[model samples]
Target: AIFSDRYKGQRVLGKGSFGEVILCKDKITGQECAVKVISKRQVKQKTDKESLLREVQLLKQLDHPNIMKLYEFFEDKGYFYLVGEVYTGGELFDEIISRKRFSEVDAARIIRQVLSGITYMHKNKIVHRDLKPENLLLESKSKDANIRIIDFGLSTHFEASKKMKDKIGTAYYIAPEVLHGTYDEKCDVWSTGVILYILLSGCPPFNGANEYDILKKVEKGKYTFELPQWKKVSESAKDLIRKMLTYVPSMRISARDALDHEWIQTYTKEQISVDVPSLDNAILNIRQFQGTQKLAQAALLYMGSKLTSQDETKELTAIFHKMDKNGDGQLDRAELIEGYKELMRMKGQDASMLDASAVEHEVDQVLDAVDFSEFVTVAMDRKTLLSRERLERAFRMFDSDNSGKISSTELATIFGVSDVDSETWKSVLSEVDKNNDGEVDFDEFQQMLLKLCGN
Candidate 1:
């Protein structure tokens, strides 16, 4: 594969032992992204190569806001070009370091996202051995502090029945057992605690004169909340950290538990004092939104993923994360009912009318088929999310070949389908196309969007 032909290199994003990171514009999408140029000569060892490929494969499989998205990987003669989503804010620490310092609430908001990501990973039986602050990328400059945990360099699969053994991870973030050459997925919990510690106090809980002193302190499971910053942190935050940094691996708090802890919940409530204007309308829209064709649902997903910016969905994403209380990455009926009740209560309205069975039945009717991204498209403020200009951008994407109108075949291909069968294609067209012309133009497209997603 020719990296030059696919991506136009802008400048060096960063440098590392594995390779250098470059900012590149994707030729096809015309969107900026980060490309890792791993020198083939440097990655000669089997271990390094396996982990490199593993991280790529992992990113490709995992779909979550906190995880980095790997677009594609191509290898030429000299290097392997791994294209991933570009994170604008440098590092998580740089945020706290840049803005003076973080309040306890600020630290909890950031760590809450990380803990949610970890819960997703651990549920899948994967362990990210290194959960240091340096590995976290601030994916946006939004007030939510949307964080993307990149560089799964030391991640590995684990089974509950079988114990994992390795001194795998960065220093200062490693668990005590990591120093003993034995540990499991719980090691990540320790690192999360260390990261939370730093986020709160702006320094590691355990540090020494040199590497050994740091290692010695960690090996003994000795740490203190003796910093001046800890004086202001809440007792709940300290208690949660203690649970995560517990010396016994089995006794350490699970990622799911950490997410459910009093500290995370209390701070999140304080942060989201409710309201993202038109979001009251947005939730009503969610109840009204329905899809008749996979193409339409996919189009909504495309809009959310491409046309809209992260800042647009920051509030929505936070809402979604809050609803997913179990940290399973999806909202079940119980969660939906509870969230609706709370949202309604916050609005000074009685939410008792929400029937749990009805909510389940709604999804059973295929509403469950819509994804988090698709839901996001329907659940955001319609006026702000899809302006007239934004609708045209989507239409132009579908109107491949500059035909000024979208035919069924063009819609299929643009949506990544080879071609929908005649029956489905006609169904899709009938839903969006109004003039009975057997094709969709800008007018019909806008009308459909307004009728379906707007008031």
Candidate 2:
């Protein structure tokens, strides 16, 4: 196909039994991208080939920042090429270990962004049967990098009348219901809880020496934050983790509720810290942890993709455009409140929960007339509030030496530390330093800056 001519192949990014992911460059656009080349012969089973194709189909319909994007697709006699954006940063597990100042605040920040992605998927009826650390890729190796949830090979759609009952997911993170051969989107929440637990304490809540031992621990659905580690963590943080890790699927907190929890809300509102040297200690063991790998199994998927089309969201877009009477991208506080009230009434929903002051506070941070994209996203999910411009401004504030880059000292200043010692700065550098130069250049700086912003 003509599309193939636009891309020049690079090196192999990764390889699996059925296919390999290649790093390639766009000839005309001059952009680097990752391409998945699946061998038709490798997929000997017809159902297996269709299932592999289904993964591409689901990826094609998803358009969130936290999720990877599939730019296009093409096929040759022997292979199917899935052209996609390249994520230069490494896995989530690696980034956590590379952090020197990781705490509940950082953990909350990461979980909040991830939950936003999961919340979007669940709303659209896409259940990521696999939500493990290996599948969570960072867009770039930066402190403010946003995560891209990749490898939707086992992801599927489901319906309310037909709940999923498949034994899937890595041993330690799998929910109890999944083990029982029945579950739904709530299983994703349990996985998130497990991830949060590991991030905070640096150890799995349920674990043993082997897979059997770990699975047994997880099946019991009972785990603790442990001593020395729990001592430094705030009760509020632990409370949220406990709620998500609940034994009962119905009792587990949904991604939306997890986002709204006081722990998430408080951390997002104000920067906070947690004491837990054990977190860094446990991080060392993560690489050796058997449960850190992905597990393969058959499972019934949940909810079909409900991604919105231009025409479907026309009314919402029209409302957003109408509210921005000034023609600026932003809407005033009063205008937004009025627009939200009208939206609630139009949908026959209650507007009693609308907090005008809180809304105003959120709007003030943007420093612009609310753009249509911003309005629509905020209308749908509150976690979509991280603005690109706002994040850039924060980055500029940290470029203290005005060297067009951020140094460990500058990062220390932002983190409220007076001096950079104890190899703490090394962890921060490892993230943003792409060249191994011990400093972040402007290109690296911008990548880190926009990592957390919602698309």
Candidate 3:
């Protein structure tokens, strides 16, 4: 059969060092396929015999819906030929770029298939050493088309019974152990972990100005999830990634192992619908409050961030707002009790106002029993100061020194317990005892005692 007429007028689909891939419609079945024509000059780069042999060998071992299939291959004296399933979508890098970064659910769908493909190959002892987004192709219809992990120029077969220690792969996607020239199937797991990290956070786990800098960071296992940014990010997702990217290859999350993680389960569930608010907003809000010394606000922000998506945030905000009765920014004891009562009711609990009161009283008892650094007091407006002046007098009794410093023991004495286990009294002392004298003096006593505590 003449080569030209056999593949009759195939149009170019893609290109590689081997040759240009052309799209051709099968005359008999009307099915489309990509036929790659490899030039002898490209095969001569290193070792044509070894390179072509590796591709043929690896492709024969792989069989997965997620993996691209090599339908056929042939070679003329000077040029080799490859006929593969046509992949029409594009590169994974393009997918990420087009989406500006995928949500946890969106990312998981793509990642899951990638892992499935990798696991199949690993089971067969084939390693596509250079696994990067550029080599990951998505078909036009991701539902049916293969999310192909392609390009086997760096392919090699790892013996299932032997440990692999090859030092060949891309620098950016390379694992720390691989760079050190000691790697196994686990190195691919490491690279996959990096890809996961980037998908979730829109950035690489390890980065530097140059190769040495990047390698040094990877060697040190220096990466931060500090994405207080992706807060609604399930702890499971974070935990799985953390485990997979462990500096120790023995500890890394493997392609097979990751499939069973709880994060993946949640990821699968959430993908049923793509409308979810990221925990990003909530996390950002909490960090902002934490920075401003509004811990109560931070707590509220955290609760909001835990929601699955933006749609949930609105509901969370309303719930939190109701807890902040009277439109105050934070919840006081009364509001907290009311909120708890509502929450209990939501759980179908049978309770009454008396139960709520008891709960509130117990909270007070617990708080008063300890020397906590802060107190849960109603945030009073400026107007209340004049009327609350009477409560200020109570602090005068504890202000024995009149020196503006209140000691821990003295604070413990205020509530009339020789030493309550709770440290609320100590906290009061710490704050009011401004000069670090361990005692609250007249000025300190007046400011905290008279103004804030209502004595």
Candidate 4:
């Protein structure tokens, strides 16, 4: 109904029993995104409606470069519309089938991305119950890795000691424990192994004439790399696959360890060229960009997070990962200095010409105060940073009550506060609230963010 007001439909991207996904452009933002419009009449059971909300909630909680993003949500009397970044590059296996052949080196890189994406999910205690070729998608026709984990219909929040009794996941990818009516996050690793197997060989590890036979073969936990298709694949790749596809969850490699596996490290390690403008701009922006506004800092932190799929943001993410050194998902001041020194030396710049002490002081300014979030935000173009769509999404994040305005309590929620400190919100709100009636509307929030980016 009102959904058409904001997003103008282009064409059908996909279809499902629930409804259909359409390619559309945000009227305000002018960027193409997919909208999954599920019909209300198709829902029967009461929990089915509840499940839809929970799935949306789950997608919103997740934030990773390799995971699908739920940008916004809307619904009317007849349908539920889910706004997400469009994926037209098709499924993972489809591309492989078309290629007819795939290399282990490229397979290794793809698997590494899958492993990291799954690792992020496991760390958050959420499991993707349904994993298959159709669910694993490439964001676009980009040559580089942009694989995204999609479809969470059967996924659920999990606890370590709590065993999942339900049998979930595709037949070929389902773990043995899932068939046994008890499983955990380890089930996802098994699914990933199945994908890794197909990555090298164009066929599934457990090929059955039907679902029953496939489940039987999967339950047996038997697969071999003896096929002629796998003849050229490395022993190390087979070894990792064996470890991941183990029948016993206890023996399978954990997601964290799999990321550190030699196969992943040896293949997925990519170094950006120092001569590239993206790299140069990334380095320059990180060192030079500074904002004196408090509201701007908070807004930028929120806005910057949504840039995960952007090309420059991807470049910056790579740079940040290299800088993180310890792999703790954060960059300390010491690491920043070390990272810069490494970058300088890596760039093949004359060490004697640039004073290390001056560079240290320059890198010191922005981070020394609030612990800057990540390099992706600082290094990205200011125009992209001022994206009204992302800013609107950020406002919706704070306006959780659907009140069309952000109150101090809602603001506190974003910053994680138990007691509402009126003084803290008063100062922040005072700057954005032009009406002075208290609380921040979408316009007020956008104004504060726009001023921050000098837009």
Top of the candidates by TM-score: 2
Worst 10 residues of 3 by lDDT: 159-168
Superposed model 3: Cα runs more than 4 Å off: 1-5, 17-20, 24-31, 37-58, 141-146, 152-154, 157-169, 210-212, 227-232, 270-276, 279-455
* Model 4 steric clash pairs: none
> What does candidate 2's lDDT look like per residue over 34-89, in tens digits?
87665554343334556656656766888888887887777655556677888988
Per-residue CA lDDT of candidate 1, range 1-455, in tens?
66666677665565432555778887798999887766554444344556657766766787778876778887655556678899987766545543433456666788889988888877766677767765788877755568888755433422111100011124568788877878888888999998777666655687643345567889888889875546666789899999999999999999899999998998776634332112122122112211112234334433333434344355545665776646565755455445434533333221111223333443343335554334444443432333344456646644436787765444443332212233544554466654466467777655543443321
**Model 4 alpha-carbon drift over 4 Å, by segment:** 16-19, 40-58, 76-78, 98-101, 157-169, 270-455
TM-scores for every candidate against the unseen true structure:
0.53, 0.55, 0.51, 0.52
Model 1 off-target regions past 4 Å?
43-55, 76-78, 153-169, 271-455
The parts of candidate 2 lying over 4 Å away from their true place are 1-6, 15-19, 39-58, 74-80, 157-169, 271-455
lDDT of the candidates, in the order given: 0.59, 0.60, 0.54, 0.59
Number of clashing residue pairs in every model? 0, 12, 28, 0
lDDT of 2: 0.60
Give the lDDT ranking, best first: 2, 4, 1, 3
Cα displacement (angstroms), candidate 4, residue 254, comes to 1.7
Better of 1 and 3 by lDDT: 1
lDDT of 4 by residue, 1-455 (tens): 35667776765564332345677788898999877666544433334556667666776877998887888777665556778887777766545434423455567778888888889988877677667656778988756548987754434422111111111124667788877978989988998898787666655698654446667788887877766646556678888998999888898899999999988876665552232122222122212111111122345443333342254455545666866547565767766666655554443221111235534654665355436535435533432434444456645543446798865444543322112133544555566664566466778656544443333
Deviation from truth (RMSD, Å), model 3: 27.5
